[PDB]
From Swiss-Prot, chains A, B:
Residues of the full protein shown: 3264 to 3569 of 7096
Recorded superkingdom: Viruses
Protein name listed in UniProt: 3C-like proteinase nsp5
Role description: Cleaves the C-terminus of replicase polyprotein at 11 sites. Recognizes substrates containing the core sequence [ILMVF]-Q-|-[SGACN]. Cleaves and inactivates human TRMT1, preventing tRNA guanine(26)-dimethylation of tRNAs. May cleave human NLRP1 in lung epithelial cells, thereby activating the NLRP1 inflammasome pathway. May cleave human GSDMD, triggering alternative GSDME-mediated epithelial cell death upon activation of the NLRP1 inflammasome, which may enhance the release interleukins 1B, 6, 16 and 18. Also able to bind an ADP-ribose-1''-phosphate (ADRP).
Regulation of its activity: Inhibited by pyridone-containing alpha-ketoamides compounds 13a and 13b. In turn, alpha-ketoamide 13b (tert-butyl (1-((S)-1-(((S)-4-(benzylamino)-3,4-dioxo-1-((S)-2-oxopyrrolidin-3-yl)butan-2-yl)amino)-3-cyclopropyl-1-oxopropan-2-yl)-2-oxo-1,2-dihydropyridin-3-yl)carbamate) inhibits SARS-CoV-2 replication in human lung cells. Inhibited ex vivo by michael acceptor inhibitor N3. Inhibited ex vivo by compound 11a and 11b.
Outcome of substituting P132H: In strain: Omicron/BA.1, Omicron/BA.2, Omicron/BA.2.12.1, Omicron/BA.2.75, Omicron/BA.4, Omicron/BA.5, Omicron/BQ.1.1, Omicron/XBB.1.5, Omicron/EG.5.1
Sequence ranges on the Cytoplasmic membrane side: 1-306
Catalytic activity: TSAVLQ-|-SGFRK-NH2 and SGVTFQ-|-GKFKK the two peptides corresponding to the two self-cleavage sites of the SARS 3C-like proteinase are the two most reactive peptide substrates. The enzyme exhibits a strong preference for substrates containing Gln at P1 position and Leu at P2 position
Gene: rep
Cross-link (Glycyl lysine isopeptide (Lys-Gly) (interchain with G-Cter in ubiquitin)): K5, K90
Cell location: Host cytoplasm; Host Golgi apparatus; Host nucleus
Domain Peptidase C30: 1-306
Active-site residues per Swiss-Prot or TrEMBL entry: H41, C145
Record text on subunit structure and interactions: 3CL-PRO exists as monomer and homodimer. Only the homodimer shows catalytic activity. Interacts with host FBXO22; this interaction promotes the proteasomal degradation of nsp5.
Record note on what altering N142A does: Does not affect ability to cleave and inactivate human TRMT1
Length: 306, 306
């Protein structure tokens, strides 16, 4: 028992990481079959990032001006296609290490593991959540553009994220692996307004189920409520609106614990209004929102991979 | 920027995990060169775990009663040596996937990554700290005995932990890879008293340096103090005694921030006594103690591996 922010094993992802260079500018790429995906800002200089024209810049550029080290193995580029904000570099060799994969585009509120890389060399792995405003609150230093986010399904790697930029607010934005940004962001150096952030209510209710399962009872109440009523309280506390599709998804945990979603909302409602007052829930003194119900299910009931 | 509980890439460790079976009882092993290390409680039944005699039990047992799947590859055992609380099973094949490794024995207060496995299949990876009382507060379900903890040094994997048991208190105990338990614990089913736990002061002071680096200033104070004086306050709050060897180790962060250890203790001292009062430090409302100074240095200044 116990309960921790667990991340997926990174084995299958570490051997798709390579190093991309072009002019001075160097960052990370992802190698899968004969192709290297990377952020197209790679073609840009410090001066270019202010008001860059990708076409006019991309056109002074042909294959033999793109380095692609893969440790010490040297890939050679024969072709180069811009696809939205990613760049697809085609290469002579194909990755022996290519997992059974797929690109996907996730929704605000879902969780993935992030593999932070510098010079195509992996340095660490953490779990984080796409916030409602389409930013992530991660850990990225200068050089980390091209690091990726992923979920694992027994054998299959879903790629859901590629890191493109830090904002002036010190949060992170980026694209899917088709190159379409998450949120209203562009790959350009200017003040980009984010959006009001919100607490992910479906994930917080999952977090409280994890707590009961693990012996954390004290916050369970003798009261109760309805949906439309609870949302009202969730309005003035900047929680997201809970719906029917979230009562459905949370059903299995209701079945295990034997506590109906709405008897659980009644506990939370009380928590928003009266706070925690010197009290912890799984050694945390605020309401954790980065565990989907799917995450809690697979950590409280063990799961094979690979 | 930003700051997260980061864990080491697990690639190098996932391909040493195998599945060990013996009677009914099945758990995880670690395969390195020609040897499989595992917990010796593998030879025990549910009834045996109450008052087990390892000798008399080990002696009814020879090689051909030890299964060792490595996915679907079948290892055959030719020999079997008990070494303290681990068991060393020798096998016909040698691991092509064996990293440049070494066993070590760490100290209370140091951090490692844990790779939780079921049936020799990796399921997730988290960062945690050996507590002063030699327990870890991890995430382990039935079947997770034999999962390991590790640090990575560019190319080299240090193995520092093998999971042996959960206590009635729902915390975890286990051994080094030579088979000597951490703490006063035995591999037997009885009430085992742990010990008073303590906050790791050197790691908390590191955590506050990480915060200043990242824009978290508010808690920096106009006051100050000496060592012997601070410890006094740290007594009545169940913090560990800070020493000279901890001012030494913390020196580099003092050099970066330009805040002398003792000007930092003066901030903490105040925090213990007056609390946080509705206030967060890197989105946390209590004093985090699971980041060594070494961890903060390598997350706030990026590090290549492999």
């Amino acid at each position: 028992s116990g309960f921790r922010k667990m991340a997926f094993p990174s084995g299958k992802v570490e051997g798709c990481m390579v190093q991309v260079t072009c002019g001075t500018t160097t960052l990370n790429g992802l190698w899968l079959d004969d192709v290297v995906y990377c952020p197209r800002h790679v073609i840009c200089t410090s001066e270019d990032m202010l008001n860059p024209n990708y076409e006019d810049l991309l056109i002074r550029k042909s294959n033999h001006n793109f380095l692609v080290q893969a440790g010490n193995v040297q890939l050679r580029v024969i072709g180069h296609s811009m696809q939205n904000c990613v760049l697809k570099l085609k290469v002579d060799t194909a990755n022996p290490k290519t997992p059974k994969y797929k690109f996907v585009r996730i929704q605000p509120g879902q969780t993935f593991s992030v593999l932070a890389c510098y010079n195509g060399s992996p340095s660490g792995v953490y779990q984080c959540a796409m916030r409602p405003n389409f930013t992530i609150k991660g850990s990225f230093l200068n050089g980390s553009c091209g690091s990726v986010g992923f979920n694992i399904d027994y054998d299959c790697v879903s790629f859901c994220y590629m890191h493109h930029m830090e904002l002036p607010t010190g949060v992170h934005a980026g694209t899917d692996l088709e190159g379409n940004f998450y949120g209203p962001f562009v790959d350009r150096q200017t003040a980009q307004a984010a959006g009001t952030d919100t607490t992910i209510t479906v994930n917080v209710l999952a977090w409280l189920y994890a707590a009961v399962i693990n012996g954390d009872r004290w916050f369970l109440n003798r009261f109760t409520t309805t949906l439309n009523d609870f949302n009202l309280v969730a309005m003035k506390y900047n929680y997201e609106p809970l719906t029917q599709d979230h009562v459905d998804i949370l059903g299995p945990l209701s079945a295990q614990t034997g506590i109906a979603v709405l008897d659980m909302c009644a506990s939370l409602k009380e928590l928003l209004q009266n706070g925690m007052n010197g009290r912890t829930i799984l050694g945390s003194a605020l309401l954790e929102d980065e565990f989907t119900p799917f995450d809690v299910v697979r950590q409280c009931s063990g799961v094979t991979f690979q």
